[PDB]
Amino acid sequence: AASPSVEEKLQKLHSEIKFALKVDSPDVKRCLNALEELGTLQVTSQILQKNTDVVATLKKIRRYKANKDVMEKAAEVYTRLKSRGS
């Protein structure tokens, strides 16, 4: 059946990553869930080049100190994107 494209899904995932880093109310699980979908999404160079700002945020959470898990999942995901891009 039809399903939304990676970039369409990315709109949600990127937003969840950002909501998970709310200073007022951070939510690690929210980031992890977004990261894990993003980790399986085909963010190949076609999508990656039009979504460089996402890669920019992924670099921020890979060093996240307020929650270790966020940094780990961001890392596993971010590295996987490099394995699909150019």
Give how far the C-alpha of residue 8 lies from the chain's centroid of Cα atoms, to the nearest Å.
13
φ/ψ (deg, to 5) at 42? -80, 85
Residue located via tokens 């894990």: 36
Instruction: Return d(Cα 17, Cα 83) in angstroms, integer.
Output: 21
Helices marked H in 21-67 — which ranges?
Answer: 28-38, 45-48, 52-61
Could you tell me which of 42, 40, 37, 46 has the C-alpha nearest to residue 14? 37
Domain ranges of the chain: 1-86
